[PDB]
Amino acid sequence: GATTRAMIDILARSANGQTGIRKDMLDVTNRRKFDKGEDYEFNANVDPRQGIYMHVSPEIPQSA
Amino acid sequence: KLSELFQMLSVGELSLIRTGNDGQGIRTQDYPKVIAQLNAGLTNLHARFPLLEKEVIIQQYEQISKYYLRSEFAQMNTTSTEKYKYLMDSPTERFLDDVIRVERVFDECGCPLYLNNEPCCGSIVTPSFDCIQIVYPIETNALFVTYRANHPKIALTTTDLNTEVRIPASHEKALTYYIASQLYSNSPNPETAAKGVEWSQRFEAECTKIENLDLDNAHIAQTNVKPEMRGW
Amino acid sequence: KLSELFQMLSVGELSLIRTGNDGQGIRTQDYPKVIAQLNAGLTNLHARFPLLEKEVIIQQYEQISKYYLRSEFAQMNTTSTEKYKYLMDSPTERFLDDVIRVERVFDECGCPLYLNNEPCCGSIVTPSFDCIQIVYPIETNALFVTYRANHPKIALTTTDLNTEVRIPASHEKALTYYIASQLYSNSPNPETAAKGVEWSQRFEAECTKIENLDLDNAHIAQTNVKPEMRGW
Amino acid sequence: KLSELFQMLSVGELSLIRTGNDGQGIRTQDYPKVIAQLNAGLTNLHARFPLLEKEVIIQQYEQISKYYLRSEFAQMNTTSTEKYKYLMDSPTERFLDDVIRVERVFDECGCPLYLNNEPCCGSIVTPSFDCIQIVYPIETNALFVTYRANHPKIALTTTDLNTEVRIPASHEKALTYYIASQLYSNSPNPETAAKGVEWSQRFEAECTKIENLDLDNAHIAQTNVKPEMRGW
Amino acid sequence: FIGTAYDVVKTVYDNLGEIQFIYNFLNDYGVLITVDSVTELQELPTTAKYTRVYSS
Amino acid sequence: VEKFIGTAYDVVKTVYDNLGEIQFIYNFLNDYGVLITVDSVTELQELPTTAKYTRVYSS
Amino acid sequence: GNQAGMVEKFIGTAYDVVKTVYDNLGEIQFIYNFLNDYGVLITVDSVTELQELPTTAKYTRVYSS
Amino acid sequence: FIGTAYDVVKTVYDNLGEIQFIYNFLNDYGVLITVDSVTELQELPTTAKYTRVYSS
Numbered sequence: 001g002a003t004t005r006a007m008i009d010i011l012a013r014s015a016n017g018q019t020g021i022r023k024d025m026l027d028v029t030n031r032r033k034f035d036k037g038e039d040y041e042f043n044a045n046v047d048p049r050q051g052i053y054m055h056v057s058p059e060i061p062q063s064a
Numbered sequence: 065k066l067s068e069l070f071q072m073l074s075v076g077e078l079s080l081i082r083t084g085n086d087g088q089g090i091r092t093q094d095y096p097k098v099i100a101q102l103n104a105g106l107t108n109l110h111a112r113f114p115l116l117e118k119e120v121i122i123q124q125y126e127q128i129s130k131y132y133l134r135s136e137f138a139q140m141n142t143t144s145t146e147k148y149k150y151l152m153d154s155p156t157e158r159f160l161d162d163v164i165r166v167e168r169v170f171d172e173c174g175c176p177l178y179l180n181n182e183p184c185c186g187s188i189v190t191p192s193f194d195c196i197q198i199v200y201p202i203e204t205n206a207l208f209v210t211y212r213a214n215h216p217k218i219a220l221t222t223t224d225l226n227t228e229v230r231i232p233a234s235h236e237k238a239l240t241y242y243i244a245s246q247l248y249s250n251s252p253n254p255e256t257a258a259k260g261v262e263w264s265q266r267f268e269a270e271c272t273k274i275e276n277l278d279l280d281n282a283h284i285a286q287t288n289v290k291p292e293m294r295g296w
Numbered sequence: 297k298l299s300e301l302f303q304m305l306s307v308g309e310l311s312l313i314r315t316g317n318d319g320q321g322i323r324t325q326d327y328p329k330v331i332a333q334l335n336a337g338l339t340n341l342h343a344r345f346p347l348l349e350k351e352v353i354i355q356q357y358e359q360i361s362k363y364y365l366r367s368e369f370a371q372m373n374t375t376s377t378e379k380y381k382y383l384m385d386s387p388t389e390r391f392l393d394d395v396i397r398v399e400r401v402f403d404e405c406g407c408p409l410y411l412n413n414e415p416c417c418g419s420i421v422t423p424s425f426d427c428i429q430i431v432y433p434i435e436t437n438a439l440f441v442t443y444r445a446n447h448p449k450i451a452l453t454t455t456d457l458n459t460e461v462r463i464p465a466s467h468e469k470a471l472t473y474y475i476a477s478q479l480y481s482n483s484p485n486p487e488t489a490a491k492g493v494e495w496s497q498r499f500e501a502e503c504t505k506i507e508n509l510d511l512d513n514a515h516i517a518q519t520n521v522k523p524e525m526r527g528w
Numbered sequence: 529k530l531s532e533l534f535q536m537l538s539v540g541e542l543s544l545i546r547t548g549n550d551g552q553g554i555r556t557q558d559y560p561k562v563i564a565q566l567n568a569g570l571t572n573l574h575a576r577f578p579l580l581e582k583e584v585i586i587q588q589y590e591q592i593s594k595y596y597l598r599s600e601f602a603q604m605n606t607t608s609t610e611k612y613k614y615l616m617d618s619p620t621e622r623f624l625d626d627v628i629r630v631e632r633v634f635d636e637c638g639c640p641l642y643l644n645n646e647p648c649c650g651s652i653v654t655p656s657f658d659c660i661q662i663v664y665p666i667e668t669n670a671l672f673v674t675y676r677a678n679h680p681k682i683a684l685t686t687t688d689l690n691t692e693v694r695i696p697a698s699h700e701k702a703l704t705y706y707i708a709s710q711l712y713s714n715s716p717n718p719e720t721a722a723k724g725v726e727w728s729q730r731f732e733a734e735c736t737k738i739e740n741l742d743l744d745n746a747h748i749a750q751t752n753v754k755p756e757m758r759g760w
Numbered sequence: 761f762i763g764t765a766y767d768v769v770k771t772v773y774d775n776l777g778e779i780q781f782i783y784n785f786l787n788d789y790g791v792l793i794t795v796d797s798v799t800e801l802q803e804l805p806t807t808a809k810y811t812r813v814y815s816s
Numbered sequence: 817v818e819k820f821i822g823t824a825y826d827v828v829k830t831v832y833d834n835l836g837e838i839q840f841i842y843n844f845l846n847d848y849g850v851l852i853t854v855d856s857v858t859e860l861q862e863l864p865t866t867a868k869y870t871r872v873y874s875s
Numbered sequence: 876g877n878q879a880g881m882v883e884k885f886i887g888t889a890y891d892v893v894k895t896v897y898d899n900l901g902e903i904q905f906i907y908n909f910l911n912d913y914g915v916l917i918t919v920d921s922v923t924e925l926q927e928l929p930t931t932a933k934y935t936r937v938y939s940s
Numbered sequence: 941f942i943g944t945a946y947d948v949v950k951t952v953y954d955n956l957g958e959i960q961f962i963y964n965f966l967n968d969y970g971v972l973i974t975v976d977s978v979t980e981l982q983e984l985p986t987t988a989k990y991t992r993v994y995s996s
Contacts, residue, residue: 008528012522029167029745041747068452072332079483080485087329097540108701111741112737165741180748193579214697220532232425233335250542252720256484258486259489262489280425281412284412353825386885388884405823437820438825762817762819825881828946834960837956837960838893844962845899866905877941878945879945879946882949893949893952907961907962910962918970
């Protein structure tokens, strides 16, 4: 029971879906375009592979 | 008020410079020099931060397809001889040419319209920096353009010191540092140019601080509606 | 009290500068120069730290949809000729224009409302830096806006030295370093500008220290309620 | 207006230089020097940003295959002795040689045509910087060339200060910094050349800022139509 | 739906024609104006050349 | 929509608006007293002892 | 919360007055009743006004020089 | 639930009309004011032109 509870705690208390967006990435219109779901257009000083991050639950250790 | 800003500039920031008059108040002859720089500072702050967002109603006429965002076509501006004034201004919302960016465009009922969209032949395009082109204008319709607004421009010949400068107290220092940077950077003296550069860097640090703290509630996240749109 | 702050500035920090009068007290003519810098310092500390959070009640009227956070519309301010004063101030909570950031918005019963949320058409939007737009105002309702509050502004012409500066003793040094940095940075002399930069760095180090120790109980973690919301 | 720009240049930016006349207004003899630099600045801003996009109608004649974009062949320019004026100008759209880049080309009905496409033998090629070659001209057709437009050139001998400089208030500083950079860079003095370089860097920083904020609604994404074209 | 302000505005709008007719009739012909005291008589606009006062 | 009539804020604010009358009542209770008059001695008895000032009109 | 914050915000320094009034509320009702029935002796400063008083004012004292 | 302060405020609010009537009656007509000693008579406000004193 303790190991199952630990696994559920690792999988649940994490952030599954919380996606962070860098503040100085998109202007006012491009932020709305990205939120709606269409193509966006980012500034030349930011990288999409670093500005946008979607959190996923950390993998349960194989020991449990 | 403008008097407080002038006093603050005179003593504390523009102190060791001619325009400050050694901390005894800005001279009545240097007003058209602090005011020109103040307008630029207010424009910079109102364009980089959303300190004022306003809407304007544009009434559509049958023969007009290019609508210009100028006060000459305003309903309240009675000094202009324009036959058709399609801007719909009120004593509350006056449209004093304070347009910085046309963000969103709606219709009379309240349904959002596309802006600058090429594939959709029902979108409101923007030819120039101050024009609104309606390819399909109808005599019984009206637009609801919403834009980021600028501070009402303070005239260079303004003498009344009771004209209120509407900025939050948190951006008072940002505006003052910008004014100091602009006034210190005119001279080509390396020693003074270095101080101007330092003021510019400090202004850009104050702006970064306000962005990091989001004192204007600008960078606030919204509710995610993508699952609903995608059919989940 | 303001007298203690003036004495501390005069001897110890603003010593080798004109405003300090060689450590014999701030002159009665330089008050509107330390007070202007003191207001900026207090605003900076009260915006970067939560030293004062306050609430204001906004009574909704049938014909008003844009409510401005100005004392001109306050219930206790009897000097204003406004027909409708929707701010609900008390002798305890006075609303002296000390608004730094509108954080949370509630209703009369006490149910939190969304702020600046676009998809939800029941949210309280913020058009300008001091306005509260209620798209659906009801004559029998009242708002409960809660904001981070500023120190009551000390007037530039203040002469009574008994006006109390309400800051914790831990931020006394932070405020004093900020005042020294602001007063030392006005002159373009490289030697004095370097001292101003050093004071700015020391102020930013004191602020970092207070953040690291959390002397104001600001960065305190809360109980996790995500499992309950997600149905675990 | 041009008077405001001249005053702003005289006091604040071109202050410690001869052309500024120590902040008492630009002399009536130095006009053909600020105006030449102002034309270059306006051209730079109107080419790097889409501040003005315009269309011109080119009527096709049976014997003409190379159509030049010059006002000498305009319908409104009555001073020219050209037998065939194929440019179709109106009192509204005048075609004052303000062509910066020929972007899109349409036909009379409104169907887009290819531009500078070699494999398609139905495309409108561009031989020179101001020519439009129609290999297949028809006497009963007309073109609808759309181009990015320049500011109507201000003549070097212009004396009326009421000529309006149509730029947004956000690009006022960019234009002024460009003028300062161009005027400061003429002299080979290392100290003045450094200030000219600093002005150039600041102009390129203002342009980068406006690009990052997209104040002209230029870098806006469009609806994706590739799935429809590819048959998904 | 509680549109109290809009309800008042719409109720006024439904009877706007009566207001227009009243204004046109009063500005076109000219009727007798009656005022209680001598004070508001002086505070009356000069456009009312015809006045009557009731006193005790 | 919901109309908030009679809530805690409404009661507290209604009491606050009438603070002058409450203060007047407090002053009338604590500082001075009024003369309460009855018709007969029986009524003087049927009167609470808080009436320390009484006048009876008799034939 | 038991809504004590609202009382402090609006009745902060007058709570002593409010509590004192609430303590003597029965006597407040008694005093409300007497006055209602003109049970108090109304005083006027001269004649020709004692008539202007309601007929229910059975008890009156008139002041004269 | 122990809302003692709110209980007192609500109990006062339920009888607010009696307080309003008392204040209006005392400020409208003018009654006889009786004071025990000569001191509080002087400490009475000047608005009470009618006074009576009981002594031994």
